[PDB]
Design a protein around this ligand. Structure first.
Ligand SMILES: CCCCCCCCCCCCCCCCCC(=O)OC[C@H](COP(=O)([O-])OCC(O)COP(=O)([O-])OC[C@@H](COC(=O)CCCCCCCCCCCCCCCCC)OC(=O)CCCCCCCCCCCCCCCCC)OC(=O)CCCCCCCCCCCCCCCCC
Ligand SMILES: CCCCCCCCCCCCCCCCCC(=O)OC[C@H](COP(=O)([O-])OCC[N+](C)(C)C)OC(=O)CCCCCCCCCCCCCCCCC
Ligand SMILES: CCCCCCCCCCCCCCCCCC(=O)OC[C@H](COP(=O)(O)OCCN)OC(=O)CCCCCCCCCCCCCCCCC
Ligand SMILES: CCCCCCCCCCCCCCCCCC(=O)OC[C@H](COP(=O)(O)OCCN)OC(=O)CCCCCCCCCCCCCCCCC
Ligand SMILES: CCCCCCCCCCCCCCCCCC(=O)OC[C@H](COP(=O)(O)OCCN)OC(=O)CCCCCCCCCCCCCCCCC
Ligand SMILES: CCCCCCCCCCCCCCCCCC(=O)OC[C@H](COP(=O)(O)OCCN)OC(=O)CCCCCCCCCCCCCCCCC
Ligand SMILES: CCCCCCCCCCCCO[C@@H]1O[C@H](CO)[C@@H](O[C@H]2O[C@H](CO)[C@@H](O)[C@H](O)[C@H]2O)[C@H](O)[C@H]1O
Ligand SMILES: N=C(N)NC(=N)NCCc1ccc(I)c(Cl)c1
Ligand code: SF4
Ligand code: SF4
Ligand code: SF4
Lengths: 56, 176, 156, 311, 380, 69, 145
């Protein structure tokens, strides 16, 4: 991302692609390394009735 | 559904034949390959400056083992041997007896770090979060013997790394 | 005296050259070789440390044993070790090479490559991360920095 | 005063070879999205020194050779001849001003194949001998086109003197009238110096040590630089101002540096030829064209009335 | 006829008979990485044996886990929940990218084209991060298990996979610029190692070793698993049966893998990620620490393991290297009685002598590469 | 960044610059401040030998002009 | 031209490291003259920097202390010198440094971090932690045969 305008033009021309749109180095688009806590769902067998194991 | 990767007829008109002759004689496709390596020379490299910079890891990372305590300082391990039973490599060896105060505790807790496959099954099996794989991965040694951990080594690892281990557990335990 | 001082500086010079130009022969036996490749890959670029990507066994200073050493393979590994010109160092990488790892109880597996060759550095893990291996190579450099070959030579 | 001049050629040649190892590694690194040496000295500037010292204090493991004299002879011949190739080069003034300088370089370079052959004999192993013979066959094969291409160019220069190439290109680089020959000349130097995609000695043995290994390497990289200095003179002639010879030396050095970097560029860009395929590139492609262009370059000065002077 | 005791993943010993440049005989000597995996598995519970599969084709770790998990699930008569199935397809296709990058760039590196290895191995490093974020390990995740997967995706992972996928086809394009039209690359691969459709079938080939020769076969289409019948993609097919066509098939399969990944990101459903059956899958830690039933089942699942009803299954998947299967025999206990691992590279390498007929020594490197051989799975 | 390759190139370039620069200045030092005489042919050698005798100090690069007429 | 703007940025790294001596010190110790924001410093002397405009992986770094636990680390730096509280931040296992999110204090946690001690007198030596299992009969100390 720090390339000068000339150097960006030079490498875009040499490769033939708009490299700057799809840089292979990651910057701020990556997700935060601290995330809010999850709250995961429970499965279909989490019931208090009509749930006898011999039926599943 | 399928597609053909290499099923095409070259055009046999004069313009197309002369295009391929120019490619043969003027090396155009080879020059185009030179263009791509030239553009990489002027890209910023992906190298990081280790050991001053480090590769990114996550709280789930499976590294060096440690034995943990409760906030009071009591050991969490109660010698249930679930970890020893599950260990795919038979890397764990445990002996236990009643402690002088009647507590169920280990007298031996060994991990052969050269048998261990760093699979994390022990920390899944543990019912009290006593044995964990910590975040440390920089513990190479000069001798084989240094990698045969006894309980004192593993307790020292816990006291050494507990600050980071607790925070990592705090970040992932809701996924467990 | 100056004679001791000259020896101390020469040891520093030869140690600096040898740890600054560590050419590895990598025995890519199994999965641990993949993490060795990621250490040569752009993110870690071991070449930037003076560690060329792949040297020939006769131009090598360090053997990296990167994977399981089976019984069938053990003679070949020892033959390559014996052909290495000195000084030569061995890095054992991964549980398999360290002590047999997951296959420690197998009928066909050598229980640690240190039964076949002397080992300077043991890198733990299954596999060790590329960064962990790089830590081990840097640890080997520090070991070479501590050598005092010339100091011991002149006290003989 | 002349011995000073000899040393001021030999020592910079060896230093330039040392730091070409650094430059090759760093240029290859950045084309591979990495850095290359940057720890041993600032920007890796001490890396060549560490490598040189390491190699020379390394154990010189030489297996009991079938010929002690030929084991020693091969590196001496290789390095001795490599340095000799530099003494007629006009930069802009040659150390030795030879009337037949171009012919001297052709004759000396043809002797460099003996170091390959002798090192094969001394190895005391039929496998290495067979590898040597394959390398010799590649080298002599591409000597055919280099000589004929060189002859074709000299038909526009008029003499075998290397400094006359400077005069011939006062108005225009010879690469313009002779870019077809420059193309095949350039590829021939790659194959001549066993450079990728013609590095089949390294590839085939994949599929020497310490100082003696270092000496063969030094001779190889001296030849690589010299070949590219020759190419610049042959096709990219720099103008010489007799009152400011250092302007010639600056411009001519830049062209040689760039040509040498293009050797590293090419090594980073392509896969390797099979042995039979680089043999067909010579005998079935370059040689037919070189022969036809040799016929053309004999006729052209005669038919255009552009025959150069002898003196 | 000259004989060489070794010529040119692991370590191979090739005994070759030459006549000038031409290879007359090619006799691979394997077992240099035979570690008795199949025997060790007999001493493990089904869970304990799962990590052995990471270390077979140790470039395709999660695909190997999937094959074993499917086999155990079939014998157990249970099924993983839909979200686990989508995660398993998502990481199977990420794993295909990991394998195909290694397969193509080390194939190129072996014949001198060294640079694409570096470009694409920075993409491998980024996918190693996806592995590490779900499992805590970069390679041997042990993440796909019988009954589902070990843990749910951490928050934010799917966004980063999208960011990686959005840019990846350009990386393939740069790889193709170096190789696809390069005359040197074509000289090394075109009309090399031609295999006919009939010979490929009878020699036990699978995967790209079949499709390169025109056979229209892909287990994801014909015998689909977890949710492959719910995603759209094309099977690349060769026409010449040679190394160059197989190279093109692998490159196109990378593009189709991205196409599948794009669909998995969009159609990822909510729910649990392992079978809601605690006699097979361990309960959540919070339940294990509050409910008596959960603690008993946790204790038993991590000591004895679950019993598997007696029976035998041959289960196979379309792994990145071809058909990967296990013939798994249960005796009713919690440890497998027998586990034969069918590794596609075993049959492929057995066909090296056939494919190397009439070729030169340097072509053997190209043919070994086109087969994509990892001796972790060949030798087991 | 790519420009960190330049220091190695600069050292290489200076190393290749010295040979040509040294020869040029050594020739001027040893030939009275002029270019070293080129004698590829007998005629040129003959004139150079004649210059050596005409110089009076046995130096072909010491020139005598109208002052000797 | 931007060439001038690039050269100016090069010169500001010299003043950003406190003149030429400081610029050269980091060049030879760390092979990197980048200037970042000081996140904090640990009790051992390591300093932690960030620059979020760098690409992920190069956006955090540590300049190691020159002395730790009585060892000269001017040239001999090690990855194991990073204490656990900063280890989490440096490896991007978290977004917030210990200066904003301090770790939880415990009586038993090491107050003094130790780096890798292999190869030194402080190295770990394994041994069996269990007591003798069988007691031998001790014959009487007096004679009676
Ligand atoms: C040919 C060489 C041209 C010399 C000029 C190079 C230059 O200044 O460009 C930098 C500048 C930055 O390039 P970038 O890729 O965009 O860098 C991204 C950031 O801006 C990077 O900048 P930043 O944001 O990171 O700013 C901080 C950085 C900024 O870096 C700098 O301060 C620039 C330092 C470059 C100075 C180079 C001096 C060149 C002397 C010529 C003689 C040596 C060569 C022989 O500070 C530093 O790190 C300084 C470290 C010092 C490095 C050593 C430089 C000296 C090398 C020469 C030693 C000789 C003794 O590039 C340009 O603006 C383009 C103009 C240059 C023409 C390029 C033509 C390329 C060739 C054409 C294609 C043919 C290929 C065959
Ligand atoms: C011809 C003789 C040329 C001698 C070159 C001397 C090399 C100088 C040198 O050692 O580099 C600095 C080095 C730099 O130290 P370093 O090698 O420990 O580098 C530390 C920085 N990192 C962590 C990035 C590696 O100085 C020394 O290592 C001290 C030993 C000096 C050896 C020479 C003594 C004579
Ligand atoms: C008016 C009257 C005028 C009369 C004269 C007119 C003449 C002009 C028209 C003729 C043009 C002649 C071109 C001369 C160059 C040589 C051409 C050539 O040989 O190319 C063919 C060769 C092999 O071709 P291939 O694809 O294998 O198939 C042929 C076999 N069936 O393919 C190759 O050689 C490929 C090269 C392999 C090496 C690759 C590495 C080099 C790539 C980078 C090179 C950069 C360019 C070099 C510039 C050097 C500058 C000093
Ligand atoms: C397709 C890719 C192929 C890659 C192969 C590698 C090619 C490398 C090419 C290196 C040569 C580049 C030229 C570098 C110019 C050096 C600077 C210079 O001084 O240019 C001067 C030149 C005009 O001056 P001059 O060279 O003296 O010409 C007069 C005729 N005697 O400038 C005027 O033009
Ligand atoms: C700029 C172009 C403008 C176009 C218009 C110009 C019109 C005037 C020119 C017309 C000339 C046409 C003559 C072309 C003859 C081609 C002959 C031929 O095609 O033979 C090819 C073949 C060798 O090819 P190969 O691959 O080894 O075997 C074939 C199996 N695939 O069979 C062979 O064995 C090849 C023949 C033997 C080798 C001949 C060597 C030629 C002589 C070498 C020197 C070149 C010519 C004189 C200098
Ligand atoms: C087993 C070990 C094998 C090792 C072999 C390695 C070979 C090393 C190189 C051998 C040297 C061969 C000498 C060839 C020099 C020919 C160059 C030349 O022709 O010019 C040099 C000079 C005449 O200069 P020139 O300008 O051409 O004419 C006079 C003025 N118009 O002419 C002279 O200066 C006369 C010099 C005569 C002495 C030459 C003796 C050569 C013996 C080498 C053996
Ligand atoms: C370029 C100029 C550099 C000038 C530097 C001058 C330094 C002079 C001191 C040389 C020190 C060499 O150090 C020594 O090198 C030889 C290389 O064969 C090594 O090897 C030697 O010792 C080992 C046993 O130790 C032997 O098995 C081996 O056959 C022998 O060659 C030594 O292990 C190493 O201690
Ligand atoms: N091919 C590369 N450029 N790297 C590499 N392996 N270089 C070889 C290193 C070397 C050899 C001889 C000498 I003298 C010096 Cl100073 C350095
Ligand atoms: S990580 Fe796996 S192999 Fe290592 S001790 Fe724990 S259960 Fe055993
Ligand atoms: S570490 Fe945990 S699982 Fe292992 S014996 Fe102790 S309490 Fe049981
Ligand atoms: S130690 Fe682990 S990663 Fe390394 S070869 Fe053995 S099983 Fe594979």
């Amino acid at each position: 991302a720090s390339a000068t305008r000339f150097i960006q033009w030079l490498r875009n021309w040499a490769s033939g692609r708009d490299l700057q749109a799809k840089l292979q180095l990651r910057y701020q688009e990556i997700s935060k390394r601290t995330q809010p806590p999850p709250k995961l769902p429970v499965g279909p067998s989490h019931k208090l009735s009509n749930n006898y194991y011999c039926t599943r | 559904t399928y597609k053909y990767v290499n099923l095409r007829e070259p055009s046999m008109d004069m313009k197309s034949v002369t295009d391929r002759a120019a490619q043969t004689l003027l090396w155009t496709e080879l020059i185009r390959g030179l263009g791509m390596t030239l553009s990489y020379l002027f890209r910023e490299p992906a190298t990081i400056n280790y050991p001053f910079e480090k590769g990114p890891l996550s709280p789930r990372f499976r590294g060096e083992h440690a034995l943990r305590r409760y906030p009071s300082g009591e050991e969490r391990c109660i010698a249930c041997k679930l970890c020893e039973a599950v260990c795919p490599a038979q890397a764990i060896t445990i002996e236990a007896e009643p402690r002088a105060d009647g507590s169920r505790r280990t007298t031996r807790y060994d991990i052969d770090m050269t048998k261990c496959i760093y699979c994390g099954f022990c920390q899944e099996a543990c019912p009290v979060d006593a044995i964990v794989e910590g975040p440390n991965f920089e513990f190479s040694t000069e001798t084989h013997e240094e990698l045969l951990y006894n309980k004192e080594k593993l307790l020292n690892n816990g006291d050494k790394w507990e600050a980071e281990i607790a925070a990592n557990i705090q970040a992932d335990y809701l996924y467990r | 005296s100056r004679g001791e001082y000259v020896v101390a500086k020469l040891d520093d010079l030869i140690n600096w050259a040898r740890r600054s130009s560590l050419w590895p022969m990598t025995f890519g036996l199994a999965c641990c070789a993949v993490e060795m490749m990621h250490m040569a890959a752009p993110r870690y670029d071991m070449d930037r440390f003076g560690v060329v990507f792949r040297a020939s066994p006769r131009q090598s200073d360090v053997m990296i044993v990167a994977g399981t050493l089976t019984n069938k393979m053990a003679p070949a590994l020892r033959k390559v070790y014996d052909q290495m010109p000195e000084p030569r160092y061995v890095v054992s990488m991964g549980s398999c090479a360290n002590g047999g790892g997951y296959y420690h109880y197998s009928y066909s597996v050598v229980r640690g490559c240190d039964r076949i060759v002397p080992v300077d550095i043991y890198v733990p893990g299954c596999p060790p991360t590329a960064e962990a291996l790089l830590y081990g190579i840097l640890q080997l450099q520090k070991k070479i920095k501590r050598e005092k070959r010339l100091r011991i030579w002149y006290r003989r | 005063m002349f011995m000073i001049n000899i040393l001021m050629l030999i020592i910079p040649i060896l230093l330039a070879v040392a730091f070409l190892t650094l430059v090759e590694r760093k240029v290859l690194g950045y084309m591979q999205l990495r850095k290359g040496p940057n720890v041993v000295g600032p920007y890796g500037l001490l890396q060549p020194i560490a490598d040189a010292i390491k190699l020379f204090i390394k154990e010189p493991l030489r297996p009991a050779t079938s010929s002690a004299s030929m084991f020693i002879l091969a590196p001496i011949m290789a390095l001795g001849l490599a340095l000799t190739m530099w003494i007629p080069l006009p930069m802009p003034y040659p150390l030795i001003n030879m009337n037949l300088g171009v012919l001297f370089m052709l004759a000396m370079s043809s002797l460099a194949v003996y170091s390959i052959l002798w090192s094969g004999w001394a190895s005391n192993s039929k496998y290495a001998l067979i590898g040597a013979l394959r390398a010799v066959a590649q080298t002599i094969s591409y000597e055919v086109t280099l000589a004929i291409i060189l002859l074709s160019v000299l038909l526009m220069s008029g003499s075998f003197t290397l400094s006359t190439l400077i005069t011939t290109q006062e108005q225009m680089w010879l690469i313009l009238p002779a870019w077809p020959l420059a193309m095949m000349w350039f590829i021939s130097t790659l194959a001549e110096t066993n450079r990728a995609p013609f590095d089949l000695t390294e590839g085939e043995s994949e599929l020497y040590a310490a100082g003696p290994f270092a000496l063969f390497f030094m001779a190889e990289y001296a030849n690589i630089i010299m070949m590219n200095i020759f190419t610049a003179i042959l096709f990219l002639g720099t103008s010489h101002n007799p009152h400011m010879p250092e302007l010639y030396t600056i411009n001519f050095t830049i062209k040689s540096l760039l040509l040498t970097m293009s050797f590293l560029w090419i090594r980073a860009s392509y896969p390797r030829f099979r042995y039979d395929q680089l043999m067909h590139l010579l005998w079935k492609n370059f040689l037919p064209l070189t022969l036809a262009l040799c016929m053309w370059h004999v006729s052209l000065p005669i038919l255009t009335s552009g025959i150069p002077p002898q003196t | 006829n000259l004989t060489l005791n070794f010529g040119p993943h692991g370590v191979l010993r090739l005994v070759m008979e030459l006549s000038g440049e031409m290879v007359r005989k090619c006799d691979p000597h394997i077992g240099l990485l035979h570690r008795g995996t199949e025997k060790l598995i007999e001493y493990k519970t089904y869970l304990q044996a799962l990590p052995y599969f990471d270390r077979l084709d140790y470039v395709s770790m999660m695909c190997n886990e999937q094959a074993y998990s499917l086999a155990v699930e079939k014998l157990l008569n249970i099924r993983p929940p839909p979200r686990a199935q989508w995660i398993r397809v998502l990481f199977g296709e990420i794993t295909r990218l990991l394998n195909h990058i290694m397969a193509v760039t080390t194939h190129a590196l072996d014949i001198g084209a060294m640079t694409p290895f570096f470009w694409m191995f920075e993409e491998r490093e980024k996918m190693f991060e996806f592995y590490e974020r779900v499992s805590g390990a970069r390679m041997h995740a042990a993440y796909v298990r019988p009954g589902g997967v070990h843990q749910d995706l951490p928050l934010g992972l799917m966004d980063d996979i999208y960011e990686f996928s959005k840019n990846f086809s350009l990386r393939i394009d740069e790889l193709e610029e170096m190789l696809t039209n390069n005359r040197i690359w074509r000289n090394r691969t075109v009309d090399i190692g031609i295999v006919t459709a009939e010979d490929a079938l009878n020699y036990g080939f699978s995967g790209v070793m079949l499709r390169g020769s025109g056979i229209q076969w892909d287990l994801r289409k014909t015998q689909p698993y977890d949710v492959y019948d719910q995603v759209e993609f094309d099977v690349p097919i060769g026409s010449r049966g040679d190394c160059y066509d197989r190279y093109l098939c692998r490159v196109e399969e990378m593009r189709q893998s991205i196409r599948i990944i794009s669909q998995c990101l969009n159609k990822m459903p909510p729910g649990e990620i392992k079978v809601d059956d605690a006699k097979v899958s361990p309960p959540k830690r919070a339940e294990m620490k509050t409910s008596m039933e959960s603690l008993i089942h946790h204790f038993k699942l991590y000591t004895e393991g679950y019993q598997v009803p007696p029976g035998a299954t041959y289960t196979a998947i379309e792994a990145p290297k071809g058909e990967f299967g296990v013939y798994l025999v249960s005796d009713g206990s919690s440890r497998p009685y027998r586990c034969k691992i069918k590794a596609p590279g075993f049959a492929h390498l057995a066909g090296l002598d056939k494919m190397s007929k009439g070729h030169m020594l340097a072509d053997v490197v190209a043919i070994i590469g086109t087969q994509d051989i990892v001796f972790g799975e060949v030798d087991r | 960044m790519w420009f960190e390759v330049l220091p190695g190139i600069a050292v290489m370039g200076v190393c290749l610059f010295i040979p040509g620069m040294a020869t040029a200045r050594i020739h001027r030092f040893s030939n009275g401040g002029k270019e070293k005489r080129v004698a590829h042919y007998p005629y040129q050698w003959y004139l150079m030998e004649r210059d050596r005798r005409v110089s009076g100090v046995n130096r072909s690069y010491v020139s005598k002009g109208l002052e000797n007429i | 031209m931007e060439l001038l703007q690039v050269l100016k940025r090069g010169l500001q790294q010299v003043s950003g490291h406190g003149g030429l001596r400081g610029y050269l010190r980091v060049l030879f110790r760390a092979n990197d003259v980048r200037v970042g924001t000081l996140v904090g410093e640990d009790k051992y002397g390591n300093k932690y920097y960030e620059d979020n405009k760098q690409f992920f992986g190069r956006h955090r770094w540590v300049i190691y202390t020159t002395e730790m636990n009585g060892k000269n680390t001017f040239w001999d730096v090690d990855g194991s010198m990073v204490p656990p509280e900063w280890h989490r931040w440096l490896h991007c296992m978290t977004d917030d440094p210990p200066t904003v999110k301090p770790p939880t204090a415990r009586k038993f946690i090491w107050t003094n971090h130790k780096f890798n001690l292999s190869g030194t007198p402080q190295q770990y030596v394994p041994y069996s932690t269990t007591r003798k299992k069988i007691q031998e009969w001790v014959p009487p100390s007096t004679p009676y045969k």
